[PDB]
Amino acid sequence: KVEKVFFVTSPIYYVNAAPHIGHVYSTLITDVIGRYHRVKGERVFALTGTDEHGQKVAEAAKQKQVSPYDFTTAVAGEFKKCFEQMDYSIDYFIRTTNEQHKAVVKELWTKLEQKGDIYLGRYEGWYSISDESFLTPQNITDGVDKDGNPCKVSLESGHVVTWVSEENYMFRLSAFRERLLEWYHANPGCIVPEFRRREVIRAVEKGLPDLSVSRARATLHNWAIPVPGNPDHCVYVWLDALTNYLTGSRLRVDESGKEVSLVDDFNELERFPADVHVIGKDILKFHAIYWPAFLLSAGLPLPKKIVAHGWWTKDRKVFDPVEKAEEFGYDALKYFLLRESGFSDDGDYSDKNMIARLNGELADTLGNLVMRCTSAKINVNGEWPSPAAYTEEDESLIQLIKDLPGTADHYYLIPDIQKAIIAVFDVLRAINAYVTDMAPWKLVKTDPERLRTVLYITLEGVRVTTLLLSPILPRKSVVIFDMLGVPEVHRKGIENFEFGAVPPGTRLGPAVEGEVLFSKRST
């Protein structure tokens, strides 16, 4: 019960290679969640960015034979170009090379050391460079390296692992087991979906070793943040990386989305801790185990929710998001990725199924419906009519429209965007059945009063559904509201989740001779 900036993040992505889907997916989920809270009238800060340090990224820049500084800048430019083309509404793009971020990392590091949670030790064990992840012997197995020779690989990811024996600064993660366990249990929604929350607990129950938070300077090709007070060591890319969330919460951003100052105290901008960390299933441990343990050591507040979707947010496997968005449309693609993907990789991403959902749901259910209630043939006055008396059937439909907001609200807040969309379209399917059942095209001649009632209900249903769909279909929801003639003030705010927010007499927006909202793609 504290009014605060709703702070939602994506992961920051390794810039070892171009952006692809998945990066786009993760950022989409972050964008949608942020958008939904904006239509509720809440303050929002959506964060995304790039993870530019590390052995991975340094060695990727070597293979392209160019400077780390030049390489990280260039790939990051590609991430921004991509995210702008994607038409998101993110508030800030962060980069771990940012000088103010570096400052926050060092500040955090010192905090951890002053608390006595960092000591000089050794790590002697396996490491996946591609994952920047330490692994116990039970998490590797036999495999083949890039030359076809025998080697070891992560069971997590199948990437090549190498044995590391280094004197590192070690963090006392073992000491935080009992407090994390308390945290998971006191806050049973803090990790979503449930079966990933159960995975985290089982792992932490088993026992936690201490974590290596530094590495030898040479190993990282001097591409990392120096450990404060020890120039021989660099900060573990993951500590560095996770700290972006804290950095983001402390950056004042200007008109153009550029940082202009870093604040001393996170309370100043009221963002920290994150309300939702959006992540892929591949990085759960860093966020649900390491991250909270660091925060507990530093006396910082823990995030409210971590949601981990069913995608490998990096290095999976030809599905270009821009080329698909130019083919099928931008809101349609976003709708398709959000509708087809629950909390699994079991989704069907063929063109066949993209067309089935476009035509099936977007066109026949949403599109057809929007036309009917604006059609000059049916809505002959091009206005919102005054409803007459309601039948029990009218009420049954109206009831669905009234209950829809609270239900979609809960789903968005889980967060489960698929279930929110499904819940909206269930109401859309019902409105269409109602209209088929009522044949308003016939009512124009036979019963004008009954038409008034039918058409009003259809308009409000289309408005309320379109409102709750506006985070998924941002550009199209604007086109729909324009057709319905909905004033700007009524496109936002929980006030306008209520039935009858737009008054009768409201005039529809101007039409165009060959206009179509969602265009049917031939199979």
> What is the residue-wise DSSP string for 481-514?
HHHHT--GGGGSSGGGGSTT-SPTTPBPPP--TT
Nearest approach in angstroms of CB 203 to ligand MET is: 18
What is the β-pairing status of strands 276-280 and 6-14? parallel
Q: Which is nearer to ligand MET, 286 or 497 (CB)?
A: 286
**Min separation Cβ 392 and ligand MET, Å:** 53
Nearer to ligand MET, 14 or 36 (CB): 14
Q: Give the residue with the Cβ less far from ligand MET, 238 or 481.
A: 238
Q: Would you give the DSSP letter of residue 272?
A: P
Distance of closest approach, residue 278 Cβ to ligand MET, in angstroms: 10
Which of residues 236 and 330 has its CB atom nearest to ligand MET in the complex?
Answer: 236
**CB closer to ligand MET, 211 vs 362:** 211
Residue 54 CB, shortest distance to ligand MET, in Å, is 8
* Whole-angstrom distance, CA of residue 217 vs CA of residue 224: 8
Contacts of 126 (CB under 8 A, 6+ apart): 134, 135, 136, 137, 139, 140, 152, 161, 162, 163, 164
Residue nearest to ligand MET (CB): 51
Instruction: Rank residues 59 and 383 by Cβ distance to ligand MET and give the closer one.
Output: 59
One-character DSSP codes across 337-399: HHHH-SSSS-----HHHHHHHIIIIIIIIIIHHHHHTT-TTTSTTSB-PPP-PPPHHHHHHHH
d(CA 393, CA 76) in angstroms, rounded, equals 55
Show the tokens assigned to 155.
Answer: 């069971």
Q: Are strands 214-216 and 230-235 parallel, antiparallel or unpaired?
A: antiparallel
The closest of 241, 307, 300 to 275, measured between CA atoms, is 307
**What's the min distance (Å) between Cβ of 404 and ligand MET?**
35
Locate 98 and state its tokens: 């940012």
List the Cα angle 18/22/24 in 5-degree steps: 75
- Among residues 17 and 269, whose Cβ is nearest to ligand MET? 17
In the complex, what is the shortest distance from the CB of residue 199 to ligand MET, in angstroms, rounded to a whole number? 18
Contact present, 280 and 311 (Cβ < 8 Å): yes
Least distance in angstroms from the C-beta of 72 to ligand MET: 12
Nearer to ligand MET, 128 or 465 (CB): 128
Give me the residues that bind ligand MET (CB under 6 A), please: 11-14, 51, 241-242, 283, 313-314
Q: How far is the CB of 294 from ligand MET (least distance, A)?
A: 11
Angle, CA 13 vertex, CA 10 and CA 15 arms, to 5°: 155
